[PDB]
């Protein structure tokens, strides 16, 4: 089955599950060429990002088609649509598949032969194959029961030289460390309660944030029941995961239960099989964002203040109206204990399949699949205004600027319903002639995908604590939604063969999609695939194969992008809205995204060539592929001048191109009876380039970014994901321009480009030891190149806690190349600068970025990471015998163990995001919770 003419990689269930990840994809993190895999954060139950051969869908569908058996699997993601204020991620659609049920993963990377799996495959395909029947030993029972801990990985690097203050002076109530140097003397701090105040030695507490986190605990129990006959098989499996991550409280919870029954039977001629699965999950998230969240509240802590000393609510000085600081921030323990952010999800999926062979050389297959889900979100936050505003310092004593106004409380609840039906009806033809072999396939595809939700929200809570749609004296808000798309296609795949030496393939498919304009539903995309095993004395060249392919992969549009719509009126204003009805009048407005019925289908073309060779009875192996992908005519709501009536128009874009090289080398230097040593090296390098966005709308469109701030674009000449940010003004000679009077840099007239999102190259290095029953595998993940936004640096800068801001021992400094612009009528003259950033304004110099200003907070995306370690002891059969056991493997493991990051980056594990497992996530990380080290044990027991 290496007739394949495009890159692809197979993995064995044992490798998948040996890392004991609660997920199927996060284990292969840095292990396969041209499969970029990153989890969104170390928060339990979150999404994983899997992008193959570059971002092609400029917004925002770049996951590959996961296909289980082989029915497409739903890969829907559930993250917040407002990462700046309420951040969370509740899951990837594939996170629900039980790794212990995987028998073989095969990632097809090539966009050229995709007609079997259709339009979604242009993103790659993740073909999973579930474990099946016996006979074996043995009653047919496996059991892996694991137990792991988790510890904080990288906290930002802090300064332990100056404590609580602002402008450099001492303050009792600040939320940052711009204070005098550490005397050791005794000063006050915190609010005043009942004519008393706390009083502590002014000394740094270097571990006060590290001490905040506990050790996350997660137990996992799995179980399978297996057996087979000459005409049947049957597999039943169950799995439970229960995580409580390293943030204090049950606030970071993930519970996963699955169930699965998979049976086949042959009686004929006729075969019928059926896979059915149920999957539960209950996540609770420790929200992120710029508001009153747990992390943004934690980082805003002076270096001398003891965090763990704030938990005890019986200590009045820690209750909310007397918390040590009022500046837009709350005790992080109170946040994790009184805010709610829950999700619960029930899902049913599976397939029916009826094979029927006939006339010697033919086979019939029908395959229906259904993947229905029901998920219920529930968030709510106290009425802090009613509980604490009157009569407290934080408080009535803080006027409008109190953190409590106007937090009058909120509760909301959304119930989502998803459902996909896929249908395949195929016929297959397999006849040898002389030395040839002809395999044909003709079929029909049917796909129906629908999603809907009912959301209801309620504000200003009457009983300040209780979360319930009946608990509020003000009008409630109500939202409702539903999308439904359908697709039908006809397809055919021809497979030719000559004495197991040449393998030629030709595919053709034609889809009618519901999302495209009526007079242009149909699109057609063929392909061709060659494999040559130029390996037909030695005994020295085991296997040699050369690969090429030229194919297309049409695609439709998102839903409802043709016709114009009149939404109910509503006006986006900074940090609010004005939404009709008002008052007693309802209203509709003309929709701000201009439709278009001239759309034509998207069309991806790919060229690929490859080469695979082995030596010395597969003791030295390598594989190389060169690819050239072009995703043309993509249907995108492209940005437009608001003066035109609309804010964007739906039109076919130009080519988004990914060229690159993918290389795998693997060898066994030592292989002796009792001892084998294995090396593996994989290297991917990819060249993103947007080739041309429609000119009439300008050059660029925004993919994500802040307002008046660091935003991330897609620009005509440039890669997918160009950043811009405020950069300081330079004279035509050097030369930081600074204000003649304060000393601080002067923002240049525009934002300067400051880098794309992409890695320049990605590679990993892996090694495996086997000595008797002992296994040892180590895997390193190396990604170098690119840049990302980090409020984690920003807020630690603003706050005077990052080590960086102990530069001039906070003594007043003159920016070391500074110069002044001297404007007389209309003549530009630069003077050697004489004005110093005073002590009082050192804060502002850093809060804004230093000499880089806003672009300061674009961090090097680059890291080396100790991905995983798997020590495995396979007990010898001779040790059992007297026992019911048929095999026992004790396993001890650790994941995301250590991360090494350039030098500009003392702030984040670069593997973070607050904008979801796809394109928009590459924007950055808006105080994502710390990433985490993981390590545990695992006990396999066959029966």
């Amino acid at each position: 089955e290496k007739a394949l003419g495009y890159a692809a990689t197979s993995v064995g269930g044992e490798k998948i599950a040996e890392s004991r990840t609660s997920d199927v994809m996060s284990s292969l993190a840095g292990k396969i060429a041209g499969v970029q895999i990153s989890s969104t954060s170390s928060d339990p139950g979150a999404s994983n990002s899997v992008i193959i051969r570059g971002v092609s869908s400029l917004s925002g569908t770049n996951q590959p088609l996961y296909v289980v058996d082989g029915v497409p699997l739903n890969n829907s993601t559930v993250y917040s649509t407002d990462g700046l204020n309420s951040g969370y991620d509740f899951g990837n659609g594939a996170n629900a598949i039980n790794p212990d049920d995987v028998a073989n993963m095969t990632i097809l990377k090539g966009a050229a032969a995709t007609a079997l799996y259709g339009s979604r495959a242009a993103n790659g395909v993740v073909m999973i194959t579930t474990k099946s029947g016996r006979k074996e030993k043995g009653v047919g029972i496996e059991y892996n029961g694991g137990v792991q801990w988790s510890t904080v990985l990288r906290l930002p690097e802090f300064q332990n030289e100056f404590g609580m203050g602002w402008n450099g002076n001492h303050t009792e109530l600040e939320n940052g460390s711009w204070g005098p140097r550490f005397d050791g003397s005794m000063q006050l701090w915190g609010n005043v309660y009942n004519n008393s105040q706390k009083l502590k030695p002014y000394v740094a507490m270097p571990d006060n944030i590290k001490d905040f986190f506990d050790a996350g605990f997660r137990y996992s129990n799995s179980l399978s029941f297996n057996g087979a006959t000459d005409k049947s098989d049957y597999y039943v499996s169950f799995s439970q995961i229960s995580d409580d991550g390293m943030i204090p409280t049950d606030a970071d919870s993930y519970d996963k239960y699955t169930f699965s029954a998979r049976g086949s039977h042959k009686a004929g001629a006729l075969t019928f099989s059926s896979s059915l699965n149920y999957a539960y999950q209950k996540n609770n998230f420790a929200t992120t964002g710029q508001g009153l969240s747990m992390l943004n509240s934690l980082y805003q802590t002076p270096r001398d203040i003891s965090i763990i000393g704030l938990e005890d609510q019986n200590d009045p000085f820690n209750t909310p109206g007397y918390y040590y600081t009022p500046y837009g921030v709350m005790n992080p323990y109170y946040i994790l204990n009184n805010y709610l952010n829950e999700y619960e999800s029930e899902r049913f999926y599976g397939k029916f399949q009826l094979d029927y062979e006939f006339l010697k050389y033919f086979k019939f297959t029908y395959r229906m699949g259904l993947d229905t889900t029901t998920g219920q979100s529930d968030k709510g936050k106290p009425n802090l205004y009613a509980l604490y505003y009157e009569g407290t310092p934080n408080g009535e004593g803080q006027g409008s600027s109190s953190p409590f106004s106007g937090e009058t409380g909120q509760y909301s609840e959304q119930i989502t319903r998803r459902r996909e039906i896929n249908q395949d009806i195929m016929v297959n033809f397999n006849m040898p002639v002389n030395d040839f072999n002809i395999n044909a396939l003709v079929g029909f595809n049917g796909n129906e995908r629908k999603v809907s939700y009912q959301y209801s929200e309620v504000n200003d809570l009457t009983i300040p604590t209780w979360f319930n749609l009946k608990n509020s004296g003000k009008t409630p808000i109500v939202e409702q939604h539903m999308e439904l798309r359908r697709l039908m296609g006809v397809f055919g795949q021809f497979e030719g063969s000559w004495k197991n030496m040449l393998y030629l393939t030709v595919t053709a498919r034609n889809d009618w999609s519901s999302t495209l304009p009526k007079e242009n539903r149909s699109f057609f995309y063929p392909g061709i695939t060659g494999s040559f095993i130029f390996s037909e004395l030695q005994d020295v060249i085991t296997f040699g194969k050369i690969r090429a392919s030229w194919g297309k992969t049409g695609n439709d549009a998102d839903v409802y992008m043709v016709n114009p719509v009149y939404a109910q009126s509503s006006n986006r204003i900074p940090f609010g809205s004005l939404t009709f009805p008002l008052g007693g009048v309802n209203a509709y407005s003309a929709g701000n995204v201009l439709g278009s019925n001239t759309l034509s289908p998207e069309m991806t073309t790919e060229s690929e060539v490859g080469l695979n060779m082995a030596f010395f009875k597969n003791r030295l192996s390598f594989d190389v592929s060169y690819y050239n992908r072009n995703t043309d005519k993509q249907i995108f709501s492209l940005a437009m001048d608001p003066a035109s009536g609309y804010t964007a128009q739906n039109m076919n874009l130009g080519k988004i191109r990914n060229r690159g090289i993918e290389l795998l080398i693997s060898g066994t230097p030592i292989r002796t009876k009792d001892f084998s040593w294995e090396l593996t090296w994989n290297f991917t390098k990819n060249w993103s380039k947007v080739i041309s966005l429609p000119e009439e709308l300008g050059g660029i469109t925004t993919i994500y970014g802040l307002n008046g701030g660091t935003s991330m674009y897609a620009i005509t000449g440039m890669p997918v994901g160009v950043f811009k940010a405020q950069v300081a003004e330079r004279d035509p000679q050097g030369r930081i321009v600074v204000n003649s009077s304060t000393g601080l840099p002067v923002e240049a007239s525009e934002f300067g480009i400051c880098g794309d999102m992409n890695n320049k190259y990605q590679m990993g290095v892996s090694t495996n030891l086997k000595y008797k029953g002992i296994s040892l595998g180590i895997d390193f993940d190396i990604r170098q190149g690119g840049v990302m936004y980090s409020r984690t640096k920003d807020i630690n800068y603003f706050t005077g806690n990052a080590i960086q801001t102990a530069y001039n021992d906070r003594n007043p400094l003159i920016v070391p190349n500074s110069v002044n612009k001297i404007v007389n009528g209309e003549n530009v003259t630069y003077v050697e600068n004489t004005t110093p950033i005073t002590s009082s304004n050192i804060y502002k110099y850093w809060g804004d970025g230093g000499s880089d200003m806003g672009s300061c907070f674009l961090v090097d995306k680059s890291y080396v990471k100790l991905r995983s370690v798997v020590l495995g002891w396979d007990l010898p059969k001779r040790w059992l015998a007297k026992t019911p056991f048929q095999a026992v493997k004790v396993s001890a493991y650790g994941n995301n163990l250590f991360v090494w990051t350039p030098s500009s980056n003392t702030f984040i594990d670069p593997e973070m995001t607050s904008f979801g497992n796809d394109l928009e996530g590459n924007y950055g990380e808006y105080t994502a919770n710390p990433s985490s080290r993981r390590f545990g044990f695992n006990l396999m027991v066959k029966f």
Partner: peptide, 10 residues
Amino acid sequence: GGGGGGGGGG
């Protein structure tokens, strides 16, 4: 539009 941040307190 384009999402707005917020400066803090000091």
